Structures are given as structure tokens and as C-alpha cells.
Amino acid sequence: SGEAPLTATVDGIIQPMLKAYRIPGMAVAVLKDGKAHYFNYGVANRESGQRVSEQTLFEIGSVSKTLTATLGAYAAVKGGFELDDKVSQHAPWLKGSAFDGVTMAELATYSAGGLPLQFPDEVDSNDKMQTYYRSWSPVYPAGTHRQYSNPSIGLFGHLAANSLGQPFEQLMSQTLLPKLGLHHTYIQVPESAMANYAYGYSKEDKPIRATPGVLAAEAYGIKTGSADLLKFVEANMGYQGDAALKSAIALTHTGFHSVGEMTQGLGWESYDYPVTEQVLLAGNSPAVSFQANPVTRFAVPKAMGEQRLYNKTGSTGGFGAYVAFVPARGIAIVMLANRNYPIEARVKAAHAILSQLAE
Numbered sequence: 001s002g003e004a005p006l007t008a009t010v011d012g013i014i015q016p017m018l019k020a021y022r023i024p025g026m027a028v029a030v031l032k033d034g035k036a037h038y039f040n041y042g043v044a045n046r047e048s049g050q051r052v053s054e055q056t057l058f059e060i061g062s063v064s065k066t067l068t069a070t071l072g073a074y075a076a077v078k079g080g081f082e083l084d085d086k087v088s089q090h091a092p093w094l095k096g097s098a099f100d101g102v103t104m105a106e107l108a109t110y111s112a113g114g115l116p117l118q119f120p121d122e123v124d125s126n127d128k129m130q131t132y133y134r135s136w137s138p139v140y141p142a143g144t145h146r147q148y149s150n151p152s153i154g155l156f157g158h159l160a161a162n163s164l165g166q167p168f169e170q171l172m173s174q175t176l177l178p179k180l181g182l183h184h185t186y187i188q189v190p191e192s193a194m195a196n197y198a199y200g201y202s203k204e205d206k207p208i209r210a211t212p213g214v215l216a217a218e219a220y221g222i223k224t225g226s227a228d229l230l231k232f233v234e235a236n237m238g239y240q241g242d243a244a245l246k247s248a249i250a251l252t253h254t255g256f257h258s259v260g261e262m263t264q265g266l267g268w269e270s271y272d273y274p275v276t277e278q279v280l281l282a283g284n285s286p287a288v289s290f291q292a293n294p295v296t297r298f299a300v301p302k303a304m305g306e307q308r309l310y311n312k313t314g315s316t317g318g319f320g321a322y323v324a325f326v327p328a329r330g331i332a333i334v335m336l337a338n339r340n341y342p343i344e345a346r347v348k349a350a351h352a353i354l355s356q357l358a359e
């Protein structure tokens with residue numbers, strides 16, 4: 001209590017950043033004291049001049065991994081697979097491959113043994129994708145090294161959905177999103193929503209808007225606005241309803257290993273709260289996100305609890321997203337922009353805003 005108005009705090013941090021990085025538009029949403037607050041900046045489309053709101057659709061890039069993780073956890077709770085199962089128990093076409101020796105949990109948490117950030121360029125169809133995984137030669141023993149990876153969590157989501165007999169997009173759009181109450185969140189934006197879909201703006205300042213690629217849906221393909229994304233965050237701080245979905249959300253807050261001060265869950269990565277700016281920056285730096293690291297192994301997976309900052313970055317060619325929340329204090333920040341601007345800037349701004357929300 002006794003602070004300046006929330007609008008002043010947020011404007012004071014966000015406006016200078018939008019100028020510094022020439023960000024055309026940003027939707028910011030925060031949770032504090034049990035309610036949502038929206039702060040909308042600039043334009044979703046520079047040409048039309050359409051204003052950003054909390055209903056503007058942005059590409060959230062790898063923030064998608066948190067929804068994919070929730071879907072996968074849901075499928076495990078429903079009995080489709082065990083986190084402990086070997087991957088090839090859920091993909092006949094992988095029997096005999098290195099995936100005989102990797103678990104579903106390892107796939108989800110990027111610890112299979114050196115799967116890279118991106119597929120090679122030749123992986124451009126489903127057949128080429130299957131050949132890729134069948135041919136993969138691990139660099140590290142399973143469960144020992146974390147290397148942030150689209151092929152890894154992408155395969156996890158794909159196989160998790162199929163373990164329930166459903167394609168990923170169907171399970172997400174017909175089961176998970178409706179049960180979460182997310183009705184303006186899409187893998188493929190329907191025509192009725194296209195008017196709300198922001199354009200992204202590239203490094204060379206050109207309008208771009210698409211998330212093509214193999215397993216794009218699973219790895220980085222969600223379009224949503226700040227209001228739906230904040231509602232998903234709210235579900236991560238007290239969902240009630242479908243017992244299976246409640247269990248699934250709890251599993252996303254379970255830690256499987258750590259790298260430094262960061263603990264890897266399913267989708268969400270977390271830190272002991274309060275976390276310093278320096279630690280949050282380091283955990284989201286290329287030293288952690290763009291190379292293999294040996295993990296601190298956990299004897300067992302463990303619930304990380306409420307006194308944590310949970311977060312996820314996401315980017316595409318034209319977009320830059322960040323989400324962070326602290327369940328014990330009922331605070332959260334969502335920042336969706338239509339420029340892929342530096343993760344360090346996202347983290348510094350978010351940390352500064354959360355610090356104010358906690359006081």
C-alpha cells in the first residue's frame with residue numbers, strides 16, 4: 001500500500017522500452033489483489049493503425065510450451081502415458097531407436113540427451129520428421145543434460161495427444177482450451193478472429209505473421225491475447241473444476257531437475273521467490289537457453305509450491321512475449337509485443353513491475 005497508481009508504474013517501465021526497441025504495440029496484463037488490470041500500448045497493425053487491446057491476438061511463441069505441457073500432463077492423468085514411460089512405448093515407429101532409452105518426462109523437460117533447439121531444415125514434412133527422430137544419436141546419457149529444444153517438447157506434445165487417440169490440435173481446441181475457459185486462444189486463427197490478429201514486425205522492420213514449421217503447434221504456435229493468457233495464469237493460481245485438469249496444472253508446477261537457480265517443470269520454469277533481477281536474467285540467458293548444461297538431478301520429481309516465481313519466454317520472427325507469476329502473492333505479469341525484442345529487456349521490465357506489485 002501507499003504506492004503510486006498502477007498505471008503510472010506500468011507506463012513508466014513499459015513506455016520507455018517501447019521507444020527504445022521501436023515496439024509497435026504491446027498488451028500488458030497484471031494480476032494483483034485478486035483482480036486483473038490491463039494496460040494497452042500502440043498498434044497491432046502499423047498500416048491500419050488498429051489499436052492493441054487485451055483482445056488483440058499475438059503470436060506467443062514458446063509461451064505455447066506451457067499449454068502443450070498442460071495438455072501432456074492432462075493426457076498422463078487421463079491414463080494415456082506415464083511420465084516415467086519410455087518414449088517408444090507411445091510411438092511404434094520409434095521402437096528400436098534411441099527413444100527406447102528416453103522417458104516422456106525427459107522429452108518434456110529437454111533432457112533426452114542433446115536434441116537441438118530447432119529441427120534441421122530438411123525436416124519439412126511428417127515423413128521427414130519421423131526419419132529425423134529414428135536417426136537421432138544421443139550426445140549425452142538420458143536425463144543428464146538439459147538442452148532447450150523444439151524437437152523435444154514438440155514430440156512430447158504430439159505423442160501425448162495421440163496417447164488419447166486424438167491429434168494435438170483437436171485435443172487442445174476441443175478439450176483443453178474450453179476446460180480452461182480460453183475462448184480467444186488458437187492454433188489456427190479462425191476467420192471470425194482474423195480482424196484481431198496483430199502483425200509482427202521483423203528485425204528489418206517488415207510485417208510478418210505466420211508460425212510455419214514441423215510441430216509448430218506444439219512448440220511455438222499459439223495465438224492469444226493478454227486477457228486469455230492472464231486467465232490461464234489465473235488457473236495456475238487456483239483452478240477448480242475438472243479434477244484431471246487440476247492435477248495436470250499441479251504437474252506443470254512439479255520440478256524435474258534444476259540448472260543453477262532455475263528449476264525445470266513441465267513448460268514452466270521457476271525460481272525461489274523472491275528472485276533477484278540478476279538470477280532471473282541468468283536463467284533466461286543463452287548460457288541456459290542455447291547450449292547444453294548438466295542438470296542437478298532430482299531423486300524424485302517434486303512439487304515446487306507457491307513461494308516461487310514461475311515464468312516462460314516466447315518469441316517468433318515478429319513477436320516477443322513473456323509471462324511470470326507468483327502464486328503465494330497473487331501477482332502476475334503478461335507482456336505481449338509485436339516485435340521480437342531482447343529477452344533481457346522483457347525480464348528487466350517484468351521484474352521491476354512484479355517488485356512493485358508485491359509491495
Ligand SMILES: [Zn+2]
Nearest residue numbers: 006036037038
Ligand atoms: Zn486496475
Ligand SMILES: [Zn+2]
Nearest residue numbers: 178182183184
Ligand atoms: Zn471456446
Ligand SMILES: [Zn+2]
Nearest residue numbers: 055183184193
Ligand atoms: Zn469474442
Ligand SMILES: [Zn+2]
Nearest residue numbers: 140145293294
Ligand atoms: Zn556435460
